[PDB]
Design a protein around this ligand. Sequence first.
Ligand SMILES: */C(=C1/CCOC1=O)[C@H](C[C@@H]1CCCO1)NC(=O)[C@H](CC(C)C)NC(=O)[C@H](Cc1ccc(F)cc1)NC(=O)OCc1ccccc1
Ligand SMILES: CC(C)C[C@H](NC(=O)[C@H](Cc1ccc(F)cc1)NC(=O)OCc1ccccc1)C(=O)N[C@H](/C=C1\CCOC1=O)C[C@@H]1CCCO1
Lengths: 305, 301
Amino acid sequence: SGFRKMAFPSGKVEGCMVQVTCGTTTLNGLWLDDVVYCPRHVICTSEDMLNPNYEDLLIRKSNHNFLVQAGNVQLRVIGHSMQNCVLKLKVDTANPKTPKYKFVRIQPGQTFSVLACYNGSPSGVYQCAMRPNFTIKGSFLNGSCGSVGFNIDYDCVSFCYMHHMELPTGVHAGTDLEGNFYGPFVDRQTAQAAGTDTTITVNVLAWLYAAVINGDRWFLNRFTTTLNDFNLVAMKYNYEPLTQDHVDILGPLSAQTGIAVLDMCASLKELLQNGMNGRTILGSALLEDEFTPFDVVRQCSGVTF
Amino acid sequence: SGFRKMAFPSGKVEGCMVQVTCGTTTLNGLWLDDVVYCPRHVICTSEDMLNPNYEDLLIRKSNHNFLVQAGNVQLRVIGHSMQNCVLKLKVDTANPKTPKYKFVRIQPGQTFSVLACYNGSPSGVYQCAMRPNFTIKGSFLNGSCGSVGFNIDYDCVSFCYMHHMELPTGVHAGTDLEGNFYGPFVDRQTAQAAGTDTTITVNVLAWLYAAVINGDRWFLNRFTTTLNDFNLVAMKYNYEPLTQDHVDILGPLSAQTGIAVLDMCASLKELLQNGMNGRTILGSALLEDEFTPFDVVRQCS
Ligand SMILES: */C(=C1/CCOC1=O)[C@H](C[C@@H]1CCCO1)NC(=O)[C@H](CC(C)C)NC(=O)[C@H](Cc1ccc(F)cc1)NC(=O)OCc1ccccc1
Ligand SMILES: CC(C)C[C@H](NC(=O)[C@H](Cc1ccc(F)cc1)NC(=O)OCc1ccccc1)C(=O)N[C@H](/C=C1\CCOC1=O)C[C@@H]1CCCO1
């Protein structure tokens, strides 16, 4: 038993991380088959980051302007192109450690593991959630751009995130591996702010089920609430509305524990109105929302990858 | 910026995990060079779990009684021995993925990463701390024995934990890689319980420094405390005593932030007295104690 914020094993991704240098800018790249992916702002100088014209900057750079280092071996770049906010560097050698992989775009509320890297070397791994405002609450220092987020399904690595920037509140913004930003952000050093962050209601409910599974049940009650009545309360506390799809997804956990979703919603509604009253749930004094229903089933059933 | 409960990348350890089967028991083993390490209770029968005589049980086994599987390949066992509560299986092949590694015994309050495994396959990685009562608050299901905890420094893996058992409160007990249990626990299914769990005070203080480094100052105050007065108060909240050694260890963070250690101790005294009053610190509504001073420096710099 027990319940922890667990990341996917990172070995398959560690074997793809490289170092990319253009001029004085050095960050991380993702080496898959014979291509290295990295943020396009690697071609910017500290002064070109204010109002960059990436079309112009890239036209002026050549293959030799890019230095790619895989460990202590330095990869010959034979071509380069741009796809949205990611730079694609062709190298003359396929990564022999390329795993089975896909590029996937995640949606808010879905979780993934972040492999934080510096100078092409992986330093740490942690589990994150894409927030409803399309930011992530990460831990990144300078030089961490190009770090990637991923999930593992069967034996396939699904890359879903590449790190690009930090917003003034200390939260982080990035793109998918096709270079499309998550959220209304741009890769420029102009004033930007994320919208109001809301709570991922379906994930909070999944975590309450995990708590029950592990024997935490002081918060349960005899009452049930309708989806419409619950949503009236949730919107007042900056909670995401719960849809019928969300209820369906919690079905498995609802059956395993014998607690109806709308009964858990009543428990959650009361927790929102009265707080937690000096009690904790699974070792937390806050309502945790970075576990999806699948995450709970996966951890409580010992799924391996 | 930001602050997260961060684990080490697990690849170097993934390449060492194998499946070990003896009789009807299947669990995880650690394959380093030409030796596979696993809990010795893999040799127990369903009736031998209360008072096993492991020396006697092992004498009765032959090399072919142990089935070791690295992926879909079977490793030939050519020898076996016991070191405390760990079984050592000699195989005819050195693991080509063996990293640089050390065996280390950690002290309470020290953190490490756990690679939870089942049937020799990794399922997840998470960061843990050795609690003052010599347990860990892990996430483990049946079949997880032999999962290991580790740190990585440079490219060297320091193995510090191997998982053996769960105690009635849902907490976990295991050994170092020399087979010596952390705490007074034994690999027998006789009644055992962990002592009262206390809070790792020095780690809470390091995390408050991390909060300041990250721009949070709302919990500070104008007071200072003596070390003795702090410990008299903290022990009333089931906090571990803070020693002068702990104060010395916080010196670097005290210098980086310009906040004296005993001044931060005064802030913690007030936080214990008032709670958080609906506020959070580094995204938590509780005082977190599973980050060491070393962890804070590494993650924040
Ligand atoms: C690892 C094993 C055992 C065989 O194959 C594996 O992979 C488990 C890990 C444990 C299960 C859940 C998470 O941690 N180890 C054991 O099952 C261990 C075997 C003993 C050391 C020979 N026994 C336990 O952990 C007991 C509790 C238990 C047993 C079975 C189970 F499925 C879950 C939990 N703990 C124990 O025996 O001592 C504590 C105790 C005993 C009696 C009264 C009060 C307390
Ligand atoms: C060209 C930009 C996109 C490079 C990028 N810029 C930013 O992240 C800045 C925030 C920042 C963070 C840490 C620093 F040390 C310096 C700057 N974002 C920003 O300016 O937002 C707009 C704004 C808002 C308010 C006032 C002014 C401007 C960048 O620095 N990426 C870093 C990585 C870099 C850039 C190139 O090589 C790297 O590794 C990752 C950072 C560090 C921590 C997490 O995000």
